[PDB]
Amino acid sequence: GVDAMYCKQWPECAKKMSANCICLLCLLRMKHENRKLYRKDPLVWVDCYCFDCFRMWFGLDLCEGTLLLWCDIIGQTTYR
C-alpha cells in the first residue's frame, strides 16, 4: 500500500505542502532540485526517480493512481 515512507499525507507532499517531511517523494524531489543547480540540462525519469520526473515520463496526472505506480517502481528498484 502507501507507506508514510514513500509519501506521508498524499495531496500535500506531492506539492511541497507538508513541512520538513522525510518521505522519499518529498526527499527525492530535493535531490532533484539540489541536483539541478550544478546542472542546467532538464532532468528525466532515467536519471531521476522523483515523483514528477516519473509522471512526466509516462505523462500521468497527479493522482493516487499515479502515486501507487510510482511506488511500485521505487519499490522494485530499492529491492535489487
Partner 1 sequence: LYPIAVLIDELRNEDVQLRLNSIKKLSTIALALGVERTRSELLPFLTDTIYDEDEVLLALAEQLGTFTTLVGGPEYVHCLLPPLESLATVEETVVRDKAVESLRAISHEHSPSDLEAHFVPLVKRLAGGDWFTSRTSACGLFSVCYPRVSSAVKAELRQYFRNLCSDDTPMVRRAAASKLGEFAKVLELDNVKSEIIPMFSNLASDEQDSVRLLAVEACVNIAQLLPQEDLEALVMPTLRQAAEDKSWRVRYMVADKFTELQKAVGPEITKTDLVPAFQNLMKDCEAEVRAAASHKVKEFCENLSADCRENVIMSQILPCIKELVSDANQHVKSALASVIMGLSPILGKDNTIEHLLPLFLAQLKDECPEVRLNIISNLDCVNEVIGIRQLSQSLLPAIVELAEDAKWRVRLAIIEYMPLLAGQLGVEFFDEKLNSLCMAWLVDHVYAIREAATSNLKKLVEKFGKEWAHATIIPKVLAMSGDPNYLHRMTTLFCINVLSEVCGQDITTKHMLPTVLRMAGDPVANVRFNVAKSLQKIGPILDNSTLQSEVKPILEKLTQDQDVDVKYFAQEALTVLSL
The number of beta carbons lying within 10 Å of the beta carbon of residue 8 is 16
Residue 26 or 67 having the CB closest to Zn ion: 26
In contact, 26 and 18? CB cutoff 8 Å: yes
**Contact string 40-79 vs Zn ion (x = CB under 5 A):** ---x----x-x--x--------------------------
Residue 57, binding choice from Zn ion, partner 1, none, Cβ under 5 to 8 Å by partner class: partner 1
The number of beta carbons lying within 10 Å of the beta carbon of residue 71 is 20
**What is the smallest separation between the CB atom of 79 and Zn ion, expressed in angstroms?**
21
Helix (H, G, I), strand (E, B) or coil at 8: coil
